[PDB]
Amino acid sequence: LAYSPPFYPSPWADGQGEWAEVYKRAVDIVSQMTLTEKVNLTTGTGWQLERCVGQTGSVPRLNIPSLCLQDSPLGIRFSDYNSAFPAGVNVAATWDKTLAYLRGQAMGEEFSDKGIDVQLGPAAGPLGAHPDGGRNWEGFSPDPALTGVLFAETIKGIQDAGVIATAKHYIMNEQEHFRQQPEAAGYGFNVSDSLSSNVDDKTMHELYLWPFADAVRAGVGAVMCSYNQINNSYGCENSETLNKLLKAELGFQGFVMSDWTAHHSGVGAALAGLDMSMPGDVTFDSGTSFWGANLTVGVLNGTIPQWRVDDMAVRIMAAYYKVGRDTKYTPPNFSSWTRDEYGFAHNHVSEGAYERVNEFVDVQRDHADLIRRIGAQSTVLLKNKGALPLSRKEKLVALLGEDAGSNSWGANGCDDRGCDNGTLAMAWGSGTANFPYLVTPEQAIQNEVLQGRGNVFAVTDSWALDKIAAAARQASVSLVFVNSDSGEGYLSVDGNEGDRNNITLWKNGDNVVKTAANNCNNTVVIIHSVGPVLIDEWYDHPNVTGILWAGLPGQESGNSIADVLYGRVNPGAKSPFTWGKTRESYGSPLVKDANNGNGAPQSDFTQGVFIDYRHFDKFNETPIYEFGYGLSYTTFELSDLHVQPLNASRYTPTSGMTEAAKNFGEIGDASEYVYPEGLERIHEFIYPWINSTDLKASSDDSNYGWEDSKYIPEGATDGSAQPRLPASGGAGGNPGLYEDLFRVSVKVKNTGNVAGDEVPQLYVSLGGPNEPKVVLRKFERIHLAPSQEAVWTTTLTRRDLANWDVSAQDWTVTPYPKTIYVGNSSRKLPLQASLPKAQ
Amino acid sequence: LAYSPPFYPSPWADGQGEWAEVYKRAVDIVSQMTLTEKVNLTTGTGWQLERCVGQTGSVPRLNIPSLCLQDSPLGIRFSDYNSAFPAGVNVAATWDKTLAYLRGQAMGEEFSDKGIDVQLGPAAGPLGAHPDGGRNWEGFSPDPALTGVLFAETIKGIQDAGVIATAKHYIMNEQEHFRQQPEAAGYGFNVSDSLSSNVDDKTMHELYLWPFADAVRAGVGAVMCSYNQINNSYGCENSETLNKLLKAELGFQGFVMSDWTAHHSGVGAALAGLDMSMPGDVTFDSGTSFWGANLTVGVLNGTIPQWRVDDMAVRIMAAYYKVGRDTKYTPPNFSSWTRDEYGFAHNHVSEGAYERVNEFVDVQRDHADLIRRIGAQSTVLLKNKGALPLSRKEKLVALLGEDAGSNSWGANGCDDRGCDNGTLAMAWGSGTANFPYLVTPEQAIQNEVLQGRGNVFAVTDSWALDKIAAAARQASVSLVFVNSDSGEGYLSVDGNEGDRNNITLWKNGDNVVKTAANNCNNTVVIIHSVGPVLIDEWYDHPNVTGILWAGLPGQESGNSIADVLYGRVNPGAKSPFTWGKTRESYGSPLVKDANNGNGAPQSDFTQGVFIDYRHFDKFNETPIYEFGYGLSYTTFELSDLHVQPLNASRYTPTSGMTEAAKNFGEIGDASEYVYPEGLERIHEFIYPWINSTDLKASSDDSNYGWEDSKYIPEGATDGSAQPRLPASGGAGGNPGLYEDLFRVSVKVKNTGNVAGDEVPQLYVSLGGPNEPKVVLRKFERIHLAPSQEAVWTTTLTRRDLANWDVSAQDWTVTPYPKTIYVGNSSRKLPLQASLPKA
Ligand SMILES: *[C@@H]1O[C@H](CO)[C@@H](O[C@@H]2O[C@H](CO)[C@@H](O[C@@H]3O[C@H](CO[C@H]4O[C@H](CO[C@H]5O[C@H](CO)[C@@H](O)[C@H](O)[C@@H]5O[C@H]5O[C@H](CO)[C@@H](O)[C@H](O)[C@@H]5O)[C@@H](O)[C@H](O[C@H]5O[C@H](CO)[C@@H](O)[C@H](O)[C@@H]5O[C@H]5O[C@H](CO)[C@@H](O)[C@H](O)[C@@H]5O)[C@@H]4O)[C@@H](O)[C@H](O[C@H]4O[C@H](CO)[C@@H](O)[C@H](O)[C@@H]4O[C@H]4O[C@H](CO)[C@@H](O)[C@H](O)[C@@H]4O[C@H]4O[C@H](CO)[C@@H](O)[C@H](O)[C@@H]4O)[C@@H]3O)[C@H](O)[C@H]2NC(C)=O)[C@H](O)[C@H]1NC(C)=O
Ligand SMILES: *[C@@H]1O[C@H](CO)[C@@H](O[C@@H]2O[C@H](CO)[C@@H](O[C@@H]3O[C@H](CO[C@H]4O[C@H](CO[C@H]5O[C@H](CO)[C@@H](O)[C@H](O)[C@@H]5O[C@H]5O[C@H](CO)[C@@H](O)[C@H](O)[C@@H]5O)[C@@H](O)[C@H](O[C@H]5O[C@H](CO)[C@@H](O)[C@H](O)[C@@H]5O[C@H]5O[C@H](CO)[C@@H](O)[C@H](O)[C@@H]5O)[C@@H]4O)[C@@H](O)[C@H](O[C@H]4O[C@H](CO)[C@@H](O)[C@H](O)[C@@H]4O[C@H]4O[C@H](CO)[C@@H](O)[C@H](O)[C@@H]4O[C@H]4O[C@H](CO)[C@@H](O)[C@H](O)[C@@H]4O)[C@@H]3O)[C@H](O)[C@H]2NC(C)=O)[C@H](O)[C@H]1NC(C)=O
Ligand SMILES: *[C@@H]1O[C@H](CO)[C@@H](O[C@@H]2O[C@H](CO)[C@@H](O[C@@H]3O[C@H](CO[C@H]4O[C@H](CO[C@H]5O[C@H](CO)[C@@H](O)[C@H](O)[C@@H]5O[C@H]5O[C@H](CO)[C@@H](O)[C@H](O)[C@@H]5O)[C@@H](O)[C@H](O)[C@@H]4O)[C@@H](O)[C@H](O)[C@@H]3O)[C@H](O)[C@H]2NC(C)=O)[C@H](O)[C@H]1NC(C)=O
Ligand SMILES: *[C@@H]1O[C@H](CO)[C@@H](O[C@@H]2O[C@H](CO)[C@@H](O[C@@H]3O[C@H](CO)[C@@H](O)[C@H](O)[C@@H]3O)[C@H](O)[C@H]2NC(C)=O)[C@H](O)[C@H]1NC(C)=O
Ligand SMILES: [Cl-]
Ligand SMILES: [Cl-]
Ligand SMILES: [Mg+2]
Ligand SMILES: [Mg+2]
């Protein structure tokens, strides 16, 4: 079995870089706290007991309210009068830093105005090793460079609006199957623990960890550790990933929270680098916690050093201050658990005051315009044989497919969006929000047509192929809408247990396209989907005159696609993943079977860095549509590639020592931390207090009281100055990684008759034997008027040209010659240059 | 068994009234025709053989093209790039002469531009004796006066746009069950003929015939005779209804066509007053006809007098000339049978040229605006507890019910509209058109809300009561859409064989309302339906703050209802029928069982004139919402009723004689009418020519050749001058009926704060025993600004105050005292006056 070696102690915060002032303030206030006040910040109060999906204990003596933590990465979950933004995969499709930032800002505004302190997003894990992975859509792209940039901008936008962002899921949660033992049980498997993702150190650094470095460098306040194991150590107690990679190497100064029921042990997790238990209980509404009283006891009995729990509270408070939450705080003004105006303060048990739990605060502002715009700008034009844009003089339009129409249960009619009924604007699970409304394609396009003389019919039963054919036969243009859905592992839709069982269109989609294309010579296909689908059977049909991929656009879906189809927006999105001929062209099969007996199933990441386009390139598979590809209503030309070497400082591997750990504040006698007698204990609520000064009894852990060496690795309680890792030194790693080595410029010209955007892309060949032919490094979306030329300049950093050396435990720019390729897809790379050796 | 007495001969045209010039011209051209040319005009060419649902033969020698006849009363059937207008029942709900006319004009323009010569509409039969009758919605109202006025205006509009209108279905086709023997067979009944409607002479005159008098007086070109029997004599060979009532009494100068396969015999129909056989064959694609060669033979063998077939051609050509079709003619530029560009000229057999059969001509003009308007103006506000109009600042709107949503097969996805899927904008059968598009309530209201900050959810599964409740709970206002559907007898939807099996909301509708009202304190209910529904289970729920009936609004449905709900239009429609507590409150049960053994089922019209509100009034049944009732966003008051007796000419019962019948043109030897040698005969096509000069063989009728007295009533071939009937004398009867006897005026005032329309109504009590307490006679829709007053002046004619006297066979103003009642519904009649004797 794969083994995750120990890395201890859990590094303590030090106010490095831009965290200096908030670290000082965090220390100042945590120094004033009692042990139980500190424990309160670290532990949620239990599932469904307050307003938000996660809520910490409060520190009322110091005027610190409970931190409210709320899903999702695309909008506020379980609320009202809020917006539903396009999914993260759409943002990836924009290839646009500014739209990622703006979306982050707009989301942060809405979260803030509902009284939410922590947004549980954005996501770069799963990255997207498996195209059928159920949650890839919540993130960005399988490409680490593209994902990292847009992850970071999203984080900056959320945090500039005064809400803590949470980089999730850290790390290697690349599939839903077996992510949780009780879920697997409920699906009829018998396994003793969650799936283990087994991955080598090079691949970890060069692929899966890379976007998390970006998040740390961008100043992200929190990281959410994952449900799965890595090398058979749970995400929320993996000392290698949390202590060594995230904290020691990347220099992360904020706090690690668990995914919901991803916390498995009190002492183990705390020493392995967890900082916050959510939603606080052992299991939902168990009325027990791995922390709470257990964390109080674990400190009181001398096992968990005071400096470790102090560090947790310093990290949490530093983040809270870093986004200015102390100045922006407002109390939650909604409830996650009901839409009623009135209800019990503690919903799961019907206790506390019966009070106004929803104030119905309109937080939407004008964010609808931004959502519409991102929807248009994330629409990838894959094929256009002079079909588009439409004129609005078409004699008859046919709108075809269930994906054009309405969810007859309402936009929010399926809990957690757990269905594929009507237009697919949002995929399923906890990465969801309630729609304030949903504009369907049927609605938007009919409205467009009815401004002129056009006739229009909408056939939204995908199983009525006779009716689809008949409408298609009469039409000047047939607009076919189709979809493929997936989601979080706890929710099964038509037997798809989060992960999608195939990558074929749902709801008879291939047959809708074929029936339409057989009856209409001008058939345009629009795909709403969580990721790539198989299009081999119909994409080159001579009647399929248009193909677009529109992802999961949120509330303005219809309007976003109409804008593109009628030419108000000239599409300029590029594919953020590869469109292959078969499922098998992708490699990386999901682990769908209990492949380790009754033990934890094992998923070995033997593909290494060769996922998505890197796999296709290595195995010489030809994509139908490649990573980075998309069309436009104009044409562009790239020319005049130049490389400017920059006078850069040398890389200095980091050396020396940290400071020794510090205790902040004092801990007294066990008696100080017993429950106050007049406090009415709410049932199932998780408090920091102990029942009595009997510590064994107050914990109730039937294995309580062993000597440390029986169950705690060496060094886990060592508070001395520790060595600095060579690849450490700053936020996101050694600052020498982010030294600029080269400026690379290229001319981009709009050679056609319509204004539009191009996405020029810079790929590098790092050189040497089992390195990918190309990996993406830089890109930009540039708007050009007809005939306009602009020179695009980007930079290559040391890190962009480096490889992870497992022996040095450092990033190294290898002696192999490096070559750059510039173009407008991962396969349309007409320009190139050999780079000189960099300093 | 009820018996229909003989009335013969079939009266011949005489260019009466406004028909004088076109009669002259018709005679002139028919005089030039050979027998087979004449027969060609009288007989369709067979089902699915040419472009239109009906097409006559042509007269190419005289440059007369084939007459193209097309459904429906609400828009062109089986075509493209056309409009779908609101149904006739919506027109009735407007109570607006002008909207009826304008809709007629708009329809006529579209029919004309497709190359259609005859619109198969409008309808006043079924009138609406049975609230569950499947086709009442195609017509106007069970009230004859309201129906007659709006029937007539519709006819005038169609004909002023240059298309022949067809007054249908004549007469007593009050239900779909058993209307046709083969339909009944297909539904598992064994009956030897169609249902017979048995109805007394008084009731016929005072109720069912009345709107047809209006049609005739309005100059209607054609009448379609019905599938049913009247007193056990088929509609298309009933000598009493066609010869005596329509032709002799009402003076009808145009032509009678059969409903499609309603023609039952060659000689019998011709002498009983039929003028045109549609679609021309005995049964669909039989390749035989009751006329065609049989009519040629029936003349050649001396049975059917020449004057009878000449008269048929005169009546047909006179109608064609009356609307100016000779100047407006354009060839049909579409096909009923396919939407493909190219196809065979003769669709059913794939013969003739393979040619362009659809030219896709856009005939819609700007008619969409008129459709949206009529939709708004036909929406009856039944209840409003300060819910309406909406502001567009409502925080969250819930749209609830399948009737709010889309037909997922497309607007035209069910053949002949034979389903109740998504919003109900058009009911089913032949009275249908293809939508150019359909705006759903979901679409229009979401669009409205999205102009502001309102959140909005649409739950359009009427079975997902949990989802309905949840959305309703969150809403500031819940807009519940519900429906009830019906249609023509040939098509069964969910076991409803045209006629609806009950008058309860379809698709779980009562439950949708209740679920919504239990969860939302501001629930507005919008009903789209063919006619009245039962609302007793929720109408007075304290959370039902609004109730509207929007009928069948056609293509702009969503926009029409949004206009009303958001107050761009202040609703002023009144109910054109009664909303009762139970089905039983209406009386008039349908005949749903083979009630006469294996014979023709019998339906006796024992209720007489007492249908709809007249029944309620007689049996002291209290309607939930009465005939003529509707609310508005303002209030009105009526006052100062005055009655002025007028200096009227006396009624003179008509006397004297007609002219004797005339032959127009000559008939030669049988050999002149044999098929021409070189003519390629299209299979199944109905031609006027005979196979040979052997007449018996050319007919092939296995009972051919009896002496007349064995199977033809006395007088049926009598061409002598005939007596004029006392109640005859002009178009729609004796012109003394239309003399004004009283001028009646009343003041109407808008006493509220919004501009709006009121519909003042004048009812009369004709007096005597077994007469209704009140019957509607006059009405008008009047627009008033807040505080504005206007005086409405109308008249009462002799006919308005008369009764049909079975002994005199005449209309008589009886000596019983008459009283008038003025108000704004059939029960809100605060003003009254006894009339002096005229
Ligand atoms: C103060 O106070 C406090 C509070 O109050 C307290 O505390 C307490 O304490 C106690 C003691 O005393 C405890 O208990 C314990 O615990 C433990 C732990 O757990 C956790 O973790 C795990 C893992 O581990 C690992 O890791 C970590 C981190 O993460 C660390 O820490 C450790 O040390 C380790 O390490 C290792 O490895 C790594 C990698 O991975 C590396 O790196 C290093 O170096 C090393 O090597 C896990 O597993 C767990 O989990 C589980 O559980 C949970 C709950 O908690 C859940 O949730 C999950 O799911 C899971 O489950 C599963 O499994 C189980 C079992 O366990 C079952 O049952 C189920 O069913 C399933 O399947 C966690 O998380 C532990 O371990 C322990 O236990 C043990 O013992 C018992 C008794 O007998 C049994 O039963 C079990 O089984 C076990 O066993 C084991 O061991 C033994 C000895 O010890 C042996 O014999 C056996 O064989 C086994 O072994 C195996 O395994 C191991 C591990 O892995 C290895 O090592 C080996 O090799 C083999 O393979 C107990 O339980 C508790 O916890 C606490 N509490 C709290 C609340 O905190 C104290 O005490 C006080 N003090 C005074 C003085 O007073
Ligand atoms: C020239 O040419 C031409 C052409 O080509 C020709 O013609 C022809 O002719 C033939 C003869 O010959 C014919 O046939 C015949 O016909 C008849 C008629 O039919 C129809 O109608 C009916 C009714 O009737 C009624 O009405 C009318 C009017 O509307 C009239 O016209 C008549 O006359 C009558 O009358 C009566 O009544 C009324 C009331 O209603 C009154 O008003 C009066 O006064 C009187 O009384 C009907 O019914 C029919 O119908 C049926 O048919 C159809 C087909 O067509 C169908 O669609 C329907 O549905 C029905 O059916 C049912 O029925 C049947 C039976 O009929 C069966 O089969 C089935 O299944 C079902 O159920 C029509 O519309 C007829 O009638 C005839 O028949 C007869 O006879 C046979 C043999 O014998 C038998 O079978 C039958 O049954 C019958 O019988 C009867 O009658 C007889 C005498 O006539 C007697 O004897 C017996 O007994 C019986 O009786 C009974 O019944 C009746 C009835 O109603 C009564 O009346 C009694 O009383 C009793 O009860 C035959 O068929 C044909 O049509 C023709 N064709 C064409 C194309 O046009 C000619 O011929 C030529 N000419 C030369 C010289 O050559
Ligand atoms: C990849 O992964 C996806 C997702 O898991 C897999 O998709 C799933 O594939 C299975 C297997 O094919 C599907 O189950 C099938 O669903 C069929 C359709 O079910 C729906 O429609 C039924 C019938 O609906 C028609 O008829 C009714 C009444 O007769 C009408 O109301 C309705 O409007 C329809 O009318 C049409 O058809 C009738 C004739 O039947 C005509 O007369 C009409 O004119 C008109 O043309 C209905 O009963 C049912 O309740 C459904 O609503 C079903 O027939 C078949 O037996 C089977 O159950 C899943 O639905 C599908 N799920 C998803 C999410 O797509 C996919 O298979 C997989 N691919 C591969 C290659 O592994
Ligand atoms: C302190 O943390 C410990 C865990 O380290 C908590 O003890 C654990 O509490 C859970 C209840 O949430 C126990 O689960 C129960 O186990 C029985 C055993 O068969 C099972 O039948 C129940 O369905 C349930 O799974 C678990 O056994 C227990 N673990 C041990 C080793 O004692 C404890 O509750 C925490 N204390 C506080 C104050 O929250
Ligand atoms: Cl919710
Ligand atoms: Cl059609
Ligand atoms: Mg191929
Ligand atoms: Mg226990």
Numbering used by the authors:
A (entry chain A): 23 to 861
B (entry chain B): 23 to 860
Copied sentences from the primary study:
β-d-Glucosidases (EC 3.2.1.21) are classical glycoside hydrolases that catalyse the hydrolysis of the nonreducing terminal glucose from β-linked d-gluco-oligosaccharides and aryl-β-d-glucosides. Here, the three-dimensional structures of two industrially important family GH3 β-d-glucosidases from Aspergillus fumigatus and A. oryzae, solved by molecular replacement and refined at 1.95 Å resolution, are reported. Both enzymes, which share 78% sequence identity, display a three-domain structure with the catalytic domain at the interface, as originally shown for barley β-d-glucan exohydrolase, the first three-dimensional structure solved from glycoside hydrolase family GH3.
